[PDB]
Amino acid sequence: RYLMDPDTFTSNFNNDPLVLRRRQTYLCYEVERLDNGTSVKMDQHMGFLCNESGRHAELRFLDLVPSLQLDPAQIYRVTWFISWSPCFSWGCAGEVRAFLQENTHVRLRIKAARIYDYDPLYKEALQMLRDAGAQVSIMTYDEFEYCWDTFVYRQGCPFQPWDGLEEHSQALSGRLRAILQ
**Segment contacting Na ion (CB under 5 A): 3-11, 46-54, 60-68, 131-139?**
60-68
Whether residue 147 contacts residue 111, with contact meaning beta carbons closer than 8 Å, is answered with no
Interface characters, 47-86, with Zn ion (x: CB under 5 A): ---------x------------------------------
Of the candidates 30, 32, 58, 143, the residue annotated as catalytic is 58
Rounded-to-integer distance, Cα 33 and Cα 146, Å:
20
Distances (CA, A) of 59 to 26, 27, 53, 116, 157: 12, 11, 12, 16, 32
Q: In the complex with Zn ion, which residue's Cβ is closer, 120 or 158?
A: 120
- The interface partner of residue 63, options being Na ion, Zn ion, none and the CB cut-off 5 to 8 Å by kind, is Na ion
Catalytic status, residue 102: no
Q: How far is the CB of 89 from Zn ion (least distance, A)?
A: 8
Rounded-to-integer distance, Cα 172 and Cα 166, Å:
10
Q: Which residues contact 167 (CB under 8 A, 6 or more apart)?
A: none
Instruction: Tell me if 92 is assigned to a ligand binding site.
Output: yes
Interface with Zn ion includes 92 (CB under 5 A)? yes
- The interface partner of residue 146, options being Zn ion, Na ion, none and the CB cut-off 5 to 8 Å by kind, is none
Q: Which residues contact 116 (CB under 8 A, 6 or more apart)?
A: 22, 84, 85, 86, 87, 122, 125
Q: How far is the CB of 30 from Na ion (least distance, A)?
A: 21
Residue from 87, 96, 115, 176 that binds Zn ion (CB under 5 A)?
A: 87
Q: In the complex with Na ion, which residue's Cβ is closer, 63 or 131?
A: 63
Residues with catalytic roles: 58
Binding site for Na ion (CB under 5 A): 63
The binding site for Zn(2+) consists of 56, 87, 92
